[PDB]
């Protein structure tokens, strides 16, 4: 939820650090999907600040 929740060492580094508070939830009865909950993007919140 803050700046640098995604950290890639260079622009094409192919190794990124992700700490985004991703949590998986239980799907609805009779539905094939992957539900999840996570804190919103901190680069957008940093652009808002």
């Amino acid at each position: 939820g803050a700046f640098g929740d995604i950290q890639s060492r260079t622009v094409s580094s192919s190794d990124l650090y992700a700490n985004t508070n991703l949590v998986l939830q239980r799907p609805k009865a009779g539905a094939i999907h992957v539900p999840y909950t996570q804190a919103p993007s901190g680069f957008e919140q940093w652009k808002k600040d």
């Binding site: 939820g1 508070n21 609805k28 909950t37 996570q38 804190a39 919103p40």
Partner: protein, 53 residues
């Protein structure tokens, strides 16, 4: 009815203290109260990222 589910708060513990980092997707009530004879409740609508100690 299906209702949404807010992100997990990030709880930091201290001596007789609880801090809470709260990143909401859409506006969300935080309702706290103490389990004593004076509850001192707190009904607040948090819409932005906010730290509550």
């Amino acid at each position: 009815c299906t209702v949404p589910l807010a992100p997990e708060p990030m709880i930091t513990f201290g001596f007789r203290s609880v801090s809470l980092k709260l990143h909401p997707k859409n506006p969300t009530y935080l309702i706290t109260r103490q389990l004593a004879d004076e509850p001192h409740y707190t009904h607040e609508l948090i819409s932005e990222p906010a730290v509550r100690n």
